[PDB]
């Protein structure tokens, strides 16, 4: 558990893109932990040449336009310098893959590497990267993603904005992207990561839509690191710092952007995962195969099934089952008294029937792998099947719950449905923290309850339901 | 064996390749094959909007050009056309693969794909690729290859030169990229495959190349297939055909472009596969280690290591060894006697001592395969080493052989030498056409000769370097 | 040390000849101090035939015009001229050498003579030498530099380029050496030396480059001397010289071209030295034997040599070793420990380890020498060795120092391993001004804390980096 502060951003944002509504801003600092030098550090020979010292500057792009002034307003160093430092091959940080991984349509960047289209190449995501006003005029087809260079791109270095010169003729050359811009700050939720609000093209847009909105302008998030006391200053200094962060996030408000104040760069990851999490462990893999109902009678554990699955669809769960014998047919049925109050909504419930005969058996695996990898939850009921007129327990159900744990899914095997559940529920128990680590004490008394007899049809449901819960909350 | 035309091609151009004065041109057919649909077949929807049919028209440039002007010169139907054509994911064909392998640092295509440099990226190449004026004024560092896209790139449709508009305008607005082509013309071998010699500014750079250099233009290759008789077409009407084909390959000669004429396609992979084995084989692997030389006596035993890796430099063989006990020393006298008639060139000789005590163990794994990387024939001698004071084979050997087999390179184990290599040899000979298929008589019978302990020193050497020549060359 | 504005020049122009991207513009005035006599001198005649004084003229161009005008456009007289001055046989001066021995693969020359052609021939280079249209479609075989002479070459004094006529018809039949200058200086970083940027077809050439690519030019340097106070000119006339030259240098840089302003001609002798110490100095050759090693235990260290070996590759040297006993194996797993992060860089680690046996000890010196000449710092550790079992100083470490000190190769004995390595120390502390002359406090300390066996790894390590850095650097 992290802030309260970051657990509502994390509850709002999660709820904002599962609706597909939400944008992500990355600015140059999202791509300092992978390797890139900064970019100070290039400046460096820049600001000696001209007889200044970049440590002493604070904006580098009067530096830059400085130099272009001292060589006759040629930038043929600094496009080599840039196309040198971010066309090197760098291994993609856990931000950009858990970015790739959510499910997020627009990308807008003021970096110039290619980080965030590799990360989205690697996701066997298609992404249509714009950073000419000519490409805007062309839509990649069953694109995943569309990602807004608004900077430039490195292997485009001349066209990069990088002085003041491309600042002052950003609003004129640049136009069509201030224009999707402001569209998409007013009618998506961005998130800004790695961006210190001090671009001048970014100041004037978000000034151009608070004109325009005035105090309906729509909420946005950023995420800020808080200010670090540095070895050399002193605590007056650093409480100064403080201070004036604190102002620079009000004003940030004055734009209806809520900050979130970090500890770290870490807590950046930290909620990304989180985010993820909460997307993925929304949809339950509902396993299981019984012929005998363990202790239940088949009648009660048919209506056990039905109402457990009314539960799942209730509390905004996505099924995904594989229709098996015995179980499938009656959490279909829950399914449709849930949903019919109406038509089957193809994301609330996944069937995927086992193809039957020599020929079916052969996918079988990759038909149960490519099933399980839709979910983040798998839940796991009885596990019984009869080959030679004897109940024995199945075996499709183990391979199950190998790829959930292989796939890093939350098992959930209810031990009081006996059977492959009971025995998965054991092997849990054997090593908790393998499974569950750090978890607390009201998940392992809710893990422990889950294999007690004595529980009613409710209370063994409320039971799943609020481990399963706790898991995606 | 192929046609001996296509073996002289092979010979002068892994000649050429092999100095690293070598260009790829690459034309739209070298695509072809790899999925993307023809243009004519995305010209078919424009062409009947315009009134005309794609398969009834030739000049397909002209045929864009009268759509364009049926709708004021407008681009956006194409642009978005080849953006979602040419920008679909396909997996790389063979011929990708092995010009990425090559040491070709110099390519030129007309394709508007990506295929050329995903198959740069997936051998771990830098590749510096350039569709604009601007970017010929900044160069990769570390670069291993360059290409030109000299018609635009995928991403880039608004760019691309697809109509009459584009090749009217091209020598003004890529001029730059007709001074560097012109430069490359004259001063690199190009290879042209999948080109049909029908683009406009190809024909206008080859004749300004030839009206500058009269009979004295550098000679350049071409890969083209034969005519094949159509089933609607008569006998006289594919004898016009190839005529027509004939008069076409002679007025390319007139550029001093030699054309090579194929069977089929496959001819094309099959001629990159040999010049990329014969580049590869022409650095040997001399592995073994000796404390005991089998019947030999110590001396004869190193005068003909001695000899035999005299006769590998003065056969124009690098020679990579991995220093073992007993077998090191000799071959390093050899190339010194070779090469001091002088100072030590890197390439001729790679020495690869391994690091002795636990920590080295530990990569030694890694140190064998990086060494046997380089390499594309191994030579196997001895291979007996010392443990308890007792001659023992050694182990070392059979790991190197195992990896020279999982690289899929030449194995040459010499049976007189005993030991590992004896047991090799007769490893080999076991499954003879596993590891030497469609050998013939003459492979076989040296083969069979390396197991004699008949031959002098000068025989067997002369029996290897034949075996390793014949496979190379 | 230089001015600030060289020293970032020479590390600029290091970079830039350690990629192999960089070229080299040699005017005439690179070539006047061999001994040539000024080419004002030689139309001194010329000028006094037609009435004029050379001395009153600064167009020299425009007098030979007049010449061949009053003799109707004969040249002979010109062209005998030219061939009995510059075909004369001179000594090579250092800046000719230097640049030679620099990895740069491509000169262009103003000049008539052969001076570059000699300073390459010297170096055992072939050197591709290019004056005629017709030579430009023929390259030699294995060449390390090419060089244009794109005024004409000595030995056919018919197509200098002259008078004013011979710039008049350049640009029509010296068009592919335009176009090939063109590319060269978009696509490499030229150094401009000896050149007064007074030649119309220079001037002509960089005015298209500069329309061609706008400010996006790639930056080139210039060497040019400070203009100095004439013995007859007054301090007013001196100083509109000064504004004049300033405004001069001000001009190039519309072409993005940097000039470094020299107080002599010698600092361009002094630059070039640089730039070869620092290309040179960056291979460092390691050295020494132990079997005892002195004070340290072994484990200890086996893990000095290790960091050390794995800080220089990461600190870009290039180690070299002789695969000493006891030395070897541990640089070896630094160099593998720093790279596999991966293959083994041919140029990063060079190993050569001696042959064993008679015949290897009769070539162990010419082996010893070729080893050291492609270092310019040679690091020494240790120097024990194991001959009748008792711990003896070895040799060979003596013999690698004596090649060192004769090849002007840094030397940095770490006296702290002690033997040899002591011993050498010692040996250089006793005349330090004739191994480090004009040696600063700084070095001079590194040099005293190399034989202090106080430190511990990383002390002793990071003493030994930094020296080799300010040695390199
Ligand atoms: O141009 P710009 O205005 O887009 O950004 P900037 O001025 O270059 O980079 C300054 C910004 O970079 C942000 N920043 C620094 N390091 C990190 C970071 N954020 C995340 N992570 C993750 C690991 N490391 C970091 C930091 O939040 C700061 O606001
Ligand atoms: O002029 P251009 O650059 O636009 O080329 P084009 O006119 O589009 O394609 C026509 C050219 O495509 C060539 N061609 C057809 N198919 C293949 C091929 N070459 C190799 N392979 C390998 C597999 N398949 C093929 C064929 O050699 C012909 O010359
Ligand atoms: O024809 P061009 O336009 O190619 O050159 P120019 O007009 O003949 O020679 C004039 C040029 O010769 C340059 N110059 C004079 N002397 C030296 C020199 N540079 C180096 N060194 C080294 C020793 N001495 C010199 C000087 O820098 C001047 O720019
Ligand atoms: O019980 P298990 O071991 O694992 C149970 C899991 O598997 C999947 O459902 C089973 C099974 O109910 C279904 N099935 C239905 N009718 C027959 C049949 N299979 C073989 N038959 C032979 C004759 N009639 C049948 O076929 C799936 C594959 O078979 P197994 O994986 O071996 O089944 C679910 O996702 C369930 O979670
Ligand atoms: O003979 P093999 O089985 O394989 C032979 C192949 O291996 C490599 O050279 C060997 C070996 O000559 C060398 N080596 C030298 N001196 C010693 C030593 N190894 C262990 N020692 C213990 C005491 N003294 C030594 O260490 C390499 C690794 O050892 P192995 O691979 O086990 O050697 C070549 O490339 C050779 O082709
Ligand atoms: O120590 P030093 O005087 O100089 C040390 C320098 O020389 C070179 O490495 C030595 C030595 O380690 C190596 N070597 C390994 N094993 C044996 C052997 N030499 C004779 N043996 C007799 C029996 N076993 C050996 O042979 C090189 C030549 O011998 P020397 O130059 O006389 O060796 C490095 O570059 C080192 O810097």
Same mark, same amino acid.
């Given at each position: 558990?992290?802030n309260?502060?970051?657990?509502?951003?994390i509850?709002?944002?999660?709820?904002?893109?599962?609706?597909?509504?939400?944008?992500?801003?990355?600015?140059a600092?999202?791509?300092?932990?992978?390797?890139?030098?900064?970019?100070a550090k290039?400046?460096?020979?820049?600001?000696?040449?001209?007889?200044?010292?970049?440590?002493?500057?604070?904006?580098?792009?009067?530096?830059?336009?400085?130099?272009?002034?001292?060589?006759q307003?040629?930038?043929?160093?600094?496009?080599?310098?840039?196309?040198?430092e971010?066309?090197?091959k760098?291994?993609?940080?856990?931000?950009?893959?858990?970015?790739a991984?959510?499910?997020?349509?627009?990308?807008?960047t003021?970096?110039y590497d290619?980080?965030?289209?590799?990360?989205?190449?690697?996701?066997?995501?298609?992404?249509?990267?714009?950073?000419?006003?000519?490409?805007?005029?062309?839509?990649?087809?069953?694109?995943?993603?569309?990602?807004?260079?608004?900077?430039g791109?490195?292997?485009?270095?001349?066209?990069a904005?990088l002085?003041?010169?491309?600042?002052?003729?950003?609003?004129?050359?640049?136009?069509?992207?201030?224009?999707?811009?402001?569209?998409?700050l007013?009618?998506?939720?961005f998130?800004?990561?790695?961006?210190?609000?001090?671009?001048?093209?970014?100041?004037?847009?978000?000034?151009?839509?608070?004109?325009?909105?005035?105090?309906?302008?729509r909420?946005?998030?950023?995420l800020?690191?808080?200010?670090?006391?540095?070895?050399?200053?002193?605590?007056?200094?650093?409480?100064?710092?403080?201070?004036?962060?604190?102002?620079?996030?009000?004003?940030?408000?004055?734009?209806?952007?809520?900050?979130?104040v970090?500890?770290?760069?870490?807590?950046?990851?930290?909620?990304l995962? &989180?985010?993820?999490? @909460? !997307?993925?462990?929304?949809?339950?893999?509902?396993? $299981? +195969?019984? =012929?005998?109902?363990?202790?239940? #009678?088949?009648?009660?554990?048919?209506?056990?099934?039905?109402?457990?699955?009314?539960e799942?669809? &209730?509390?905004?769960? @996505? !099924?995904?089952?594989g229709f098996?014998?015995?179980? $499938? +047919?009656? =959490?279909?049925?829950?399914?449709? #008294?849930?949903?019919?109050?109406?038509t089957?909504?193809d994301?609330?419930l996944?069937?995927?029937?086992?193809?039957?005969?020599?020929?079916?058996?052969?996918?079988?695996?990759?038909?149960?792998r490519?099933?399980?990898?839709?979910?983040?939850?798998?839940?796991?009921?009885?596990?019984?099947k009869?080959?030679?007129?004897?109940?024995?327990?199945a075996?499709?159900?183990?391979?199950?719950?190998?790829?959930?744990?292989?796939?890093?899914?939350?098992?959930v095997?209810?031990?009081?449905?006996?059977?492959?559940?009971?025995?998965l529920?054991?092997?849990?128990?054997?090593?908790?923290?393998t499974?569950?680590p750090?978890?607390?004490?009201?998940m392992?008394?809710?893990?422990?309850?889950?294999?007690?007899?004595?529980?009613s049809?409710?209370?063994?449901?409320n039971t799943?339901?609020e481990?399963?819960?706790?898991?995606?909350?």
């Amino acid at each position: 558990k992290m802030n309260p502060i970051v657990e509502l951003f994390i509850k709002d944002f999660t709820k904002e893109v599962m609706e597909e509504n939400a944008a992500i801003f990355a600015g140059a600092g999202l791509s300092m932990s992978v390797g890139y030098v900064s970019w100070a550090k290039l400046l460096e020979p820049i600001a000696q040449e001209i007889g200044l010292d970049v440590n002493k500057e604070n904006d580098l792009v009067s530096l830059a336009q400085y130099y272009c002034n001292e060589n006759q307003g040629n930038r043929g160093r600094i496009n080599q310098i840039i196309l040198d430092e971010f066309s090197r091959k760098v291994d993609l940080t856990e931000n950009h893959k858990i970015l790739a991984r959510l499910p997020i349509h627009t990308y807008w960047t003021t970096a110039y590497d290619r980080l965030i289209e590799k990360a989205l190449e690697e996701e066997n995501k298609i992404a249509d990267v714009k950073y000419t006003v000519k490409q805007l005029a062309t839509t990649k087809v069953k694109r995943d993603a569309v990602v807004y260079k608004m900077h430039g791109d490195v292997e485009h270095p001349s066209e990069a904005v990088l002085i003041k010169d491309d600042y002052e003729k950003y609003s004129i050359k640049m136009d069509p992207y201030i224009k999707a811009l402001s569209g998409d700050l007013v009618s998506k939720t961005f998130l800004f990561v790695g961006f210190s609000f001090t671009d001048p093209n970014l100041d004037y847009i978000l000034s151009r839509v608070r004109s325009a909105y005035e105090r309906d302008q729509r909420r946005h998030y950023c995420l800020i690191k808080k200010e670090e006391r540095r070895p050399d200053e002193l605590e007056a200094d650093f409480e100064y710092r403080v201070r004036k962060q604190e102002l620079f996030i009000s004003d940030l408000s004055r734009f209806n952007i809520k900050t979130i104040v970090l500890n770290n760069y870490n807590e950046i990851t930290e909620i990304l995962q &989180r985010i993820e999490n @909460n !997307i993925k462990t929304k949809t339950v893999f509902l396993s $299981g +195969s019984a =012929v005998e109902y363990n202790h239940w #009678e088949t009648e009660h554990a048919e209506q056990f099934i039905h109402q457990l699955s009314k539960e799942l669809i &209730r509390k905004d769960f @996505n !099924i995904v089952s594989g229709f098996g014998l015995g179980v $499938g +047919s009656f =959490v279909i049925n829950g399914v449709l #008294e849930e949903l019919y109050m109406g038509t089957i909504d193809d994301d609330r419930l996944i069937l995927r029937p086992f193809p039957q005969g020599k020929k079916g058996e052969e996918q079988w695996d990759k038909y149960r792998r490519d099933m399980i990898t839709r979910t983040g939850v798998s839940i796991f009921l009885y596990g019984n099947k009869i080959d030679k007129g004897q109940v024995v327990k199945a075996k499709g159900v183990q391979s199950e719950f190998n790829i959930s744990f292989e796939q890093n899914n939350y098992v959930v095997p209810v031990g009081a449905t006996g059977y492959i559940a009971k025995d998965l529920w054991n092997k849990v128990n054997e090593e908790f923290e393998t499974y569950y680590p750090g978890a607390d004490a009201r998940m392992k008394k809710l893990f422990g309850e889950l294999n007690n007899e004595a529980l009613s049809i409710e209370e063994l449901i409320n039971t799943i339901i609020e481990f399963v819960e706790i898991l995606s909350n």
